[PDB]
Amino acid sequence: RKVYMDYNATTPLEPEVIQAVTEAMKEAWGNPSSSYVAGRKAKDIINTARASLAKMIGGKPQDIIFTSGGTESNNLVIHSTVRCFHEQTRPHFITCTVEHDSIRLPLEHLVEDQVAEVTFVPVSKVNGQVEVEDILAAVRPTTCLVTIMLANNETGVIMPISEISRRIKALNQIRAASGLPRVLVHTDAAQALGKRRVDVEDLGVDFLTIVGHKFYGPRIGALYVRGVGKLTPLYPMLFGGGQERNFRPGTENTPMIAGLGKAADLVSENCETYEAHMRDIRDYLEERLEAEFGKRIHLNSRFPGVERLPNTCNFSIQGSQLRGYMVLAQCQTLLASVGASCHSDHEDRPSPVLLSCGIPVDVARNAVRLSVGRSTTRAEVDLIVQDLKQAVNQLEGPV
Amino acid sequence: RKVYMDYNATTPLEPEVIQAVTEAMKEAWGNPSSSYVAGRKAKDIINTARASLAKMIGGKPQDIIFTSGGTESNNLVIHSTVRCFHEQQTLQTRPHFITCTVEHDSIRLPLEHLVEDQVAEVTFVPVSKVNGQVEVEDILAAVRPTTCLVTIMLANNETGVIMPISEISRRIKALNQIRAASGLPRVLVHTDAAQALGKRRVDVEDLGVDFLTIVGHKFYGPRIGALYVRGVGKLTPLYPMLFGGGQERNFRPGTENTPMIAGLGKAADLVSENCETYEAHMRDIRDYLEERLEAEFGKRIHLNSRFPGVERLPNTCNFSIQGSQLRGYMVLAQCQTLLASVGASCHSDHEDRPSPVLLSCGIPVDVARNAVRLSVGRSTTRAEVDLIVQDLKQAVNQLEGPV
Ligand SMILES: *Cc1c(COP(=O)(O)O)cnc(C)c1O
Ligand SMILES: *Cc1c(COP(=O)(O)O)cnc(C)c1O
Numbered sequence: 001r002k003v004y005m006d007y008n009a010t011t012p013l014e015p016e017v018i019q020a021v022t023e024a025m026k027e028a029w030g031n032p033s034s035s036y037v038a039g040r041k042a043k044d045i046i047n048t049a050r051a052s053l054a055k056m057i058g059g060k061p062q063d064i065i066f067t068s069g070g071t072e073s074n075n076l077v078i079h080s081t082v083r084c085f086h087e088q089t090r091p092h093f094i095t096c097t098v099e100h101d102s103i104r105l106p107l108e109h110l111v112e113d114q115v116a117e118v119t120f121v122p123v124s125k126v127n128g129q130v131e132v133e134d135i136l137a138a139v140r141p142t143t144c145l146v147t148i149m150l151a152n153n154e155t156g157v158i159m160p161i162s163e164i165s166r167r168i169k170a171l172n173q174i175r176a177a178s179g180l181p182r183v184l185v186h187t188d189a190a191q192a193l194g195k196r197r198v199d200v201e202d203l204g205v206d207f208l209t210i211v212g213h214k215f216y217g218p219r220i221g222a223l224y225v226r227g228v229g230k231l232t233p234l235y236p237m238l239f240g241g242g243q244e245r246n247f248r249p250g251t252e253n254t255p256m257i258a259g260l261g262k263a264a265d266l267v268s269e270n271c272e273t274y275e276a277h278m279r280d281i282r283d284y285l286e287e288r289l290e291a292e293f294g295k296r297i298h299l300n301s302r303f304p305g306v307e308r309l310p311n312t313c314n315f316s317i318q319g320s321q322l323r324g325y326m327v328l329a330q331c332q333t334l335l336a337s338v339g340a341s342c343h344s345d346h347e348d349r350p351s352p353v354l355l356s357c358g359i360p361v362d363v364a365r366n367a368v369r370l371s372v373g374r375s376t377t378r379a380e381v382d383l384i385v386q387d388l389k390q391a392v393n394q395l396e397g398p399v
Numbered sequence: 400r401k402v403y404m405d406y407n408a409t410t411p412l413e414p415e416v417i418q419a420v421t422e423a424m425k426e427a428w429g430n431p432s433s434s435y436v437a438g439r440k441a442k443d444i445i446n447t448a449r450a451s452l453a454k455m456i457g458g459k460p461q462d463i464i465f466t467s468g469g470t471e472s473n474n475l476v477i478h479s480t481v482r483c484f485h486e487q488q489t490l491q492t493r494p495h496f497i498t499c500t501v502e503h504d505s506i507r508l509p510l511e512h513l514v515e516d517q518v519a520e521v522t523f524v525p526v527s528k529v530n531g532q533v534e535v536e537d538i539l540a541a542v543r544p545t546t547c548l549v550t551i552m553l554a555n556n557e558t559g560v561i562m563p564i565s566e567i568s569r570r571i572k573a574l575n576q577i578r579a580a581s582g583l584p585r586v587l588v589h590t591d592a593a594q595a596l597g598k599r600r601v602d603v604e605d606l607g608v609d610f611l612t613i614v615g616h617k618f619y620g621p622r623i624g625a626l627y628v629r630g631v632g633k634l635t636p637l638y639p640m641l642f643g644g645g646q647e648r649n650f651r652p653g654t655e656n657t658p659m660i661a662g663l664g665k666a667a668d669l670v671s672e673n674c675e676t677y678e679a680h681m682r683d684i685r686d687y688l689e690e691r692l693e694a695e696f697g698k699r700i701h702l703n704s705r706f707p708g709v710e711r712l713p714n715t716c717n718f719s720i721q722g723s724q725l726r727g728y729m730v731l732a733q734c735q736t737l738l739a740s741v742g743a744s745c746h747s748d749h750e751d752r753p754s755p756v757l758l759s760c761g762i763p764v765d766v767a768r769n770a771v772r773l774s775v776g777r778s779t780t781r782a783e784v785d786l787i788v789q790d791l792k793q794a795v796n797q798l799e800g801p802v
């Protein structure tokens with residue numbers, strides 16, 4: 001046995017989800033657009049999953065659009081916002097400096113191409129959180145969208161989405177006084193789902209990104225769009241056959257949708273359970289890491305007075321020989337990462353997100369991200385703490 | 400009890416494909432970008448599938464980019480072309496595209512959108528009203544100084560007619576030498592091969608194309624797809640529509656759907672190993688079907704997939720039985736065994752407007768209004784053909800009988 005502690009990179013599929021995908025491949029294989037029963041059958045599994053996703057986040061079914069994953073969902077909100085601005089001088093966006101590559105790069109690309117302007121608001125180097133005032137201060141007459149991740153994938157810090165939406169709703173009243181349209185709010189909730197409750201009315205957002213493989217579901221995803229086509233405009237990236245009410249054309253992937261729906265049902269039924277278990281194992285892990293390493297360890301996810309994911313513990317051990325990727329190379333049991341899985345090609349570099357959060361360069365170079373899951377046990381925490389002790393001995397030696 | 404004859408709309412998964420998706424879900428669930436053995440094993444399934452797709456089309460693994468399906472592949476080539484024309488100019492005004500009038504919605508609509516938004520110009524070349532085929536000389540005659548992409552489907556989904564892709568590529572290759580001499584941009588060629596894969600040999604060296612769309616669910620694979628780009632990064636550029644984590648060499652970012660890719664690769668392996676058997680089986684069944692339809696309906700039937708001098712898919716038989724009461728959707732509604740369609744699946748929401756594709760092909764409206772598309776598959780038998788010819792006779796009688 002290896003001990004997996006990289007659930008923020010991806011999650012295995014729950015057996016009920018594997019079953020739903022398999023059943024659908026075999027039994028609901030018809031084109032969902034087809035007029036005969038074989039078609040109507042797959043369409044029913046898709047409608048049921050649409051309702052499952054909406055229930056998971058406290059929304060309505062018609063507010064859910066299925067996509068190929070979180071990258072597409074995030075690019076779609078951004079693309080749609082540009083088109084909306086042109087159907088209403090460049091559109092302006094507000095986001096923060098620790099967003100996932102699928103929010104940061106499409107925005108950097110719009111800037112390079114001179115299509116839009118973007119303020120990448122820095123996060124507080126004190127609490128690793130973006131500050132609401134900095135967002136509000138960045139609004140311009142051409143600002144069209146605020147996009148801020150619900151939870152950070154490397155630190156686990158929760159951003160104040162609710163407060164941002166509330167304050168942006170107020171500003172929107174005054175903006176209308178000057179005939180200016182509304183600033184909308186999107187949150188990338190990839191890392192919050194199945195780890196803490198997510199409710200769109202509580203968050204106040206107009207768009208929200210859902211990523212299946214972060215909550216034991218298949219590698220597809222969706223986009224919540226508040227009262228889509230009525231309350232909130234959505235302009236497509238793709239053109240074709242009319243599926244997803246023309247917001248996302250292409251023959252629907254029924255099996256993946258069935259599994260995302262089943263995965264969503266498990267989050268609706270058990271989210272608090274998953275949360276409590278993750279918290280229990282993560283706090284135990286931090287207790288053990290401090291007990292074994294003392295003043296040599298730094299807990300990079302424990303920013304003062306801010307909420308954080310229940311399962312995440314990003315940490316560093318003091319020492320020149322303890323660069324994160326070298327510590328993990330020496331471990332024999334633990335499976336973890338030094339940052340985003342998609343950043344695995346530059347692991348010898350300190351995480352720019354940790355740098356953005358005010359973590360010193362020498363501390364960031366040594367960072368390892370442990371993210372626990374629904375099955376993780378205290379016996380497993382003990383095994384990887386022991387593994388980390390031997391790895392640190394091999395590299396830094398005794399101190 | 401039912402007999403499926405709508406394989407051009409979608410195909411069931413072969414058992415081996417299902418097994419491949421299922422094992423991959425259980426055993427290769429790791430993030431392919433991860434630096435530990437869990438992530439390297441999924442990357443390996445992904446690598447093997449990429450070679451499977453390349454072998455199926457006569458190409459090389461590095462020239463295959465996984466996508467979410469045919470719609471994305473098609474939209475991606477069009478988007479990349481716009482970006483490419485612009486990068487070339489900057490590095491040095493609207494790009495021009497040539498297509499035909501019977502393409503799938505995922506090629507026609509993105510192009511129409513480009514014209515509405517004044518981003519590109521596009522010539523929608525009409526197919527021949529004699530042979531339902533777009534003609535090489537008409538495509539060549541539509542070439543402009545700013546033409547940069549010709550995109551023509553290899554096979555039409557409604558009629559089954561094969562377009563002259565190889566000759567189009569050969570003629571464009573000769574034309575490109577003349578454009579280079581004067582400094583004009585080269586014209587690239589893409590073919591949407593959705594309906595040809597698994598039904599006839601598809602070889603990119605024979606076809607001469609620069610891009611080719613692959614759609615899994617048309618060849619008994621999962622609902623994802625791929626895009627072939629010739630010599631990507633060396634002979635042909637590919638500018639992404641999506642931005643993110645670096646997957647698919649940044650041409651198509653996002654964590655890879657390993658199970659779907661596994662299924663797609665296994666589906667491609669079956670095509671590579673058995674395409675000739677599938678093709679010949681389909682042709683025998685479809686030709687028996689046309690014989691039987693003519694034997695039963697005589698001069699009342701019109702075979703709409705029998706154009707002169709052109710090749711067609713081996714499994715497709717679009718037909719109309721004459722009569723005011725035999726509109727396609729009405730015939731199928733009375734059928735008790737046959738499962739087929741009146742046109743493409745995505746046009747199901749307007750089963751009563753006579754097919755624009757058939758009208759473009761010269762089929763008169765009285766015949767087009769009554770068209771039904773039968774498309775047979777790997778498992779279809781001659782006995783099943785007889786069951787549905789009987790089903791059709793019964794349906795026709797109900798429709799024309801007492802009130
Ligand atoms: C099926 C098909 C496609 C792809 O459509 P999807 O709904 O994305 O699977 C593209 N072109 C043709 C001609 C097709 O038949
Ligand atoms: C996983 C994740 C995504 C989605 O990435 P994909 O590779 O498309 O699954 C988006 N945002 C965040 C914060 C994530 O952690």
